[model samples]
Target: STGPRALSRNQPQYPARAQALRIEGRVKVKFDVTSAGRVENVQILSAQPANMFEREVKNAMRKWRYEAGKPGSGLVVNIIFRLNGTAQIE
Candidate 1:
């Protein structure tokens, strides 16, 4: 198996406000992984539109879970929000 595969990665939905404004942006999040595979310590490292997508990103991160492993820190994820009602994470 992989080193630490994501078990349940809940992607953030496009914010209604952003959609209304036709804004496309990205959010960079820094989070830690617990030995039990829960995500924690989620913080917004950066956001293209600032404050626009931060809350949704944080909410999604809080629901993510990874494969069980040694507690890990400094894990970074970048999520791109598109106007097509889709999002990408890496």
Candidate 2:
């Protein structure tokens, strides 16, 4: 996102098992910076598999290029992982 990713965001619908097991919540991610000041790799060094989701987050964030002057700024992102059949977000 061109704008800052929300620090406190609504989590996605987790699987029933996940919900029942209470295995879902928030995942904090730290993004790496490229030499040119672009969002590079996201590393989540934890037993939390949430870190593996870096692929999707990085892929989406990669499409966004910040203004020329901004670089090497570490962005903290909070993402909620869940799965819902029908989501009508406004």
Candidate 3:
């Protein structure tokens, strides 16, 4: 099946401001995977705490790479920033 297979994924860093404020939130992002396996055209589908984690998620997505495949669209990913300076991607 032709689909996005992650080669390398970068986790979003917890925002410094959010960390200081002890804030935890998740950002749902949609992006396209190019034939080159690079992530592009990232969009924030939804976010908890509004503007808290979108920037980090977008930045992380840009650094991610998938196994080379036909261009894939509507790849949705959710990233959660924890208060312990850790992040989880689903």
Candidate 4:
């Protein structure tokens, strides 16, 4: 399978009051991409600010659409979440 050319987003959390809390961190996840180009559950390799980081990473992966895998399959990624300008995570 192939990787996403670039990531996309539409996070309402950023504009919400969560920004006031200002929590930021990244989650490194290990996942499996099926031959059908579908992603199964992911394992968090590492997380910072545990609560927020854990939630965002899982939510994000849920919405992710793999780059099709019929040709082959495998997946493992480091999702980096940067809370720019002091804001809560999404």
Best of the candidates, lDDT:
1
Candidates 3 and 4: which is better by lDDT?
A: 3
Q: Which residue pairs clash within candidate 2?
A: 13-83
lDDT of each: 0.80, 0.48, 0.78, 0.52
Total backbone collisions for each predicted model: 0, 1, 0, 0
Residue by residue across 1-90, what tens digits does model 3's lDDT show? 456688899778755877778777777788998888998998888888767777667778888998785667878776877776677744
Model 4 scores worst on lDDT over the 10 consecutive residues at: 5-14
**Candidate 3, residue 22: CA error in Å?**
2.1
Q: Which has the better lDDT: candidate 1, or candidate 3?
A: 1
Q: Write the per-residue lDDT of candidate 1 for residues 1-90, one digit (tens) a residue.
A: 645678899878666877888778787888999989999988788887876777777778888998786556878777888777778854
Name the runs in model 4 displaced over 4 angstroms.
1-18, 70-74, 85-90
Worst 10 residues of 1 by lDDT: 81-90
Instruction: Supply the TM-score for candidate 4.
Output: 0.58
Report the C-alpha displacement of residue 19, candidate 2, in angstroms. Answer: 9.7
By TM-score, who's the top model here? 1
Winner on TM-score between 2 and 4 is: 4
What TM-score does candidate 3 reach? Answer: 0.80
TM agreement with the true structure for every prediction:
0.84, 0.42, 0.80, 0.58
lDDT of 2 by residue, 22-76 (tens): 5444556667555454666666543256644344454545654444444545666
